[PDB]
Design a protein around this ligand. Sequence first.
Ligand SMILES: Cc1ncc(COP(=O)(O)O)c(CN)c1O
Ligand SMILES: Cc1ncc(COP(=O)(O)O)c(CN)c1O
Lengths: 362, 369
Amino acid sequence: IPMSDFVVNLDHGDPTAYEEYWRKMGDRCTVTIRGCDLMSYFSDMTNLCWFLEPELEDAIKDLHGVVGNAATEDRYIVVGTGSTQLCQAAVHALSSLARSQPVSVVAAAPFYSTYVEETTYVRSGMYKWEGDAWGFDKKGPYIELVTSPNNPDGTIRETVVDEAKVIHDFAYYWPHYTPITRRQDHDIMLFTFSKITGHAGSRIGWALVKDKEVAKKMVEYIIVNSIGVSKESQVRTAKILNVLKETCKSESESENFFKYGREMMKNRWEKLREVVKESDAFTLPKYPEAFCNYFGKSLESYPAFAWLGTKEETDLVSELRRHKVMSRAGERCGSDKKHVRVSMLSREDVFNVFLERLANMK
Amino acid sequence: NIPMSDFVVNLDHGDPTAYEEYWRKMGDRCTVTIRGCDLMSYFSDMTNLCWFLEPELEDAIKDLHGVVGNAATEDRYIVVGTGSTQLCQAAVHALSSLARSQPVSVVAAAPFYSTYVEETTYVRSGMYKWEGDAWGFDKKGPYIELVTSPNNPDGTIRETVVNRPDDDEAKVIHDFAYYWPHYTPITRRQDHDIMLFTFSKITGHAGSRIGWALVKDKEVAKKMVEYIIVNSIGVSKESQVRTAKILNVLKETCKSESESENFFKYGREMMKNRWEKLREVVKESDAFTLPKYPEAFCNYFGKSLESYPAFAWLGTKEETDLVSELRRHKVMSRAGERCGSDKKHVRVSMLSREDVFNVFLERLANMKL
Ligand SMILES: Cc1ncc(COP(=O)(O)O)c(CN)c1O
Ligand SMILES: Cc1ncc(COP(=O)(O)O)c(CN)c1O
């Protein structure tokens, strides 16, 4: 079997890039759970989010503290089974408190394809996905989704359209990906564990929510949806997240996660960048340089996804399938046939194989 | 310093803390160890229809049913979900999806599991409508029937009740969350189209958030899976690995003839002890009723024996709101009106800690007196 017939799967952003890193960290990352632990449905009935584990709460807030990307004071924390359940909890919670329904849900194009799935699959009478925000005019209550750094195109975003409301999805707003220009302080701020460290099968995200009443409804949603979130997932995320925090007080460019992650993304993007340059069809986006409060230097953005473009009237997702490279169709993301989103967080060898095949075609 | 007369006894939720002592005394053999680089990927197994299902856990489920003998696992799919809670919704969603017209009606024989009302109501879906009590139901069209046996709240063994053909557009979901030897005799190896189980209610590990569905129709199975994908991109990996570990111990325990090692013996002995106690109180009390449960032959234990369900369905001949009366004694339970019954019953959980159970018995004897 040649590495011409091997399918390189860069459609999903399964973040496996980070595995060797975590392997190396050895015995301190380990989580030990005994037969009788984590048995109860409840964590703490004193918290608005009663199914959130204290060690995890502390870890989340400590971590936004050391990095300085989001405000965690005077606001409620809600955990979900990935940020996926969290964005839907928020949409359901904000829809519940709107004067009237359906509430229009929009996001600037190109947007995170999954959003169209999340807002469409249960055929709920509470909210209606209304496509691109730029092209959104419609009256009545709406919710805007703002992914920054964006998915697919990695751009830094702000809103674009008075009681209607907004959700900020800052899943990729970490120092290894983009500079920390500012400590965010918005009404609803969504984060995901999978994207910081690569632990995607842990299924953990969190929401920082200012409005007390929105936090309450997100919670109710989750309780009816899954009665909360895996305790052991939460205890594990805590340990890894704590280790990541101890890692920040290190000079080692192989211990310090954010200086490990960032170098890797730089190395990966500089490589992809050669390939694209010495090629006649392709186009990557241009990323402004910006000062980083965390790193204390002025540096470039290296997004988890490459928005791969074509200048010629090709149907770019299909061409890549033909060379055994799965990508995410641009049409899926409110773009056009000339664009693909390719994951930049795969393993070394897969990424290389991907570059190799990107060179070896017309 | 707070008198025990101020202690609230919460028998409303069914938090199964009864089983902690047992798992503690099992010690290290139960421990689960997970290293920094484990379980990182979204995917478990791209071969399986449910690609987010950990093989260690598929094996455990299949093994456990193999041994207990309560459900058929052959020639069908296994869909893991975050609790049985996510799985029933996935099922109603899947069967509705595959229906000739929507909304599909969703009914359940009363008394029924209250949380069903919220689960098929909270997102105001176009695909299905909650139609309440299945008894005498004949709204013409596609319908799903929920059959929970042993039932919640009343412990009853159940079969479908709306049994018009409505041909092939009559669908059924079986919730066998309490069909285990420590609660009820295993009279038949269940072989229905959709069978749900929850890890919570076997061993008490409720915060693990683990249930599974045994699904015959692939088209339904694939739809449950797609619902879970969008809903939550699968189920916590470490939850799955930890559920498999303890399930496996549970299984090892089954050959043990020690009354205190063997889960189902211990489990059963605990339930019995508690129902005997509660039954004494209701007997000597003046105003209380309790359901009668037939004796039946258990294929697992090989003996004819009683059910001791996880919930007590407490009633009153008297004309009072029983949920209110218990509320005045700092005993919380689940309103019978919430389960499609009347003010004269409430559901109380038999699965609390030993001390809490006892304070409730103490209080129960002191009632109306
Ligand atoms: C914009 C965006 N939102 C959310 C998700 C992550 O959701 P989860 O943590 O539920 O996997 C991703 C990919 N990890 C994403 O790119
Ligand atoms: C009938 C019934 N079904 C399902 C649930 C189990 O749900 P979960 O998977 O959320 O523990 C329960 C609570 N044990 C129940 O009583």
